[PDB]
Amino acid sequence: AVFADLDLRAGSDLKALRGLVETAAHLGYSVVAINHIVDFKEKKQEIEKPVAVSELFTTLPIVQGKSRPIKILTRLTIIVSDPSHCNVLRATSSRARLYDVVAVFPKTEKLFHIACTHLDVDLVCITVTEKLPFYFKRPPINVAIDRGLAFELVYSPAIKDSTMRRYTISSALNLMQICKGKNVIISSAAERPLEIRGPYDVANLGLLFGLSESDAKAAVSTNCRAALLHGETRKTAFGIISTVKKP
């Protein structure tokens, strides 16, 4: 029962990035992941040396739980709008095998179907900003629940405008009447040093979404475990993981 995972979308300086690690370590978070926003306009993919976790952190993260170090992982979130840009993402299966968990952000119903059936990703970002209606069809959902695909239902409405509170609750309740709530995770993309809540309080925002009476606690613990483990079988191989042990 690996508990209190995150998906943070913030990088501009090491002063604000280390502050989010110490703040998440304070409340309940044991494994903290960092996304990387890649757009289709710039066509830039900085994959080689993006973060340097062991080099640019001061060697000792401390949580109030088991007092274990934080498994700081680097994830990838690609804003995808055109099918002429996803071909570069399909070329990353053999060129650059980094960014352990890869998340995709679709915008087209023709592109949402191939991401859940044909494209090999780990999670799918569903966020609605500034009047983005999108229909949720049942055949691309019913295959993803057996395949192992999850959904980053990333919430951050309290940053700038209170009108963004409507577009998060509208798109989530469109999903809960259709997906039935098998593997849907929630996380907050925080850029400010106080935009993260405790994981005991996050589980009601998924119950604000509905999703269960009890699996809303498991939507941050159990479904985040199956979503992180989907990136491990995509990283090395799907059936055999060979690790080098040198004592």
């Binding site: 049942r138 209170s162 509170r165 409507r166 577009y167 609750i169 509208s170 309740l173 469109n174 009447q177 604000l208």
Partner: protein, 147 residues
């Protein structure tokens, strides 16, 4: 693979009938979606906006048909008494009144509108007592037998 809908009827009962002439689908969609945000918060303002749409509206008659879900019919049907001050160019004070909450099923929702319309013209006979209007009732009965 299909959604279960709920269809609720409304009726504007008020004097000063210039308010009944100032009815539009753009105004009604901006009225109901705003007064849910005034009574409830941003939860019900968007949970009753993903299936909410207008389908049937007669400004000369005053019957309002609205769309809502099985899971969220109790927020729209509870926001109906708190609809006052339809602000326009003049001074208007309408107020909606439900008739029967129909569970989907448009056909028998139109059937209840027929039996409500037939009971309204029969009471109107003796109370009005007009010779020019009674001939217009006879035009309504004769054309209804031709249907």
């Amino acid at each position: 693979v299909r959604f279960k809908h709920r269809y609720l009827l409304c009726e504007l009962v008020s004097d000063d009938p210039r308010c009944r002439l100032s009815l539009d689908d753009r105004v009604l969609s901006s009225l109901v979606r705003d007064t849910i945000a005034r009574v409830h918060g941003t939860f019900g303002a968007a949970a009753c906006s993903i299936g909410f749409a207008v389908r049937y509206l007669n400004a000369y008659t005053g019957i309002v048909l609205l769309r809502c879900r099985k899971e969220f019919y109790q927020l729209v049907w509870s926001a109906l008494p708190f609809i006052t001050y339809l602000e326009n160019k003049g001074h208007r004070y309408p107020c909606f009144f439900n008739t029967l909450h129909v569970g989907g099923t448009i056909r028998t929702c139109q059937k209840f509108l027929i039996q409500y319309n037939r009971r309204q013209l029969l009471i109107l006979l003796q109370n009005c007592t007009d010779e020019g209007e009674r001939e217009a009732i006879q035009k309504s009965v004769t054309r209804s037998c031709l249907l």
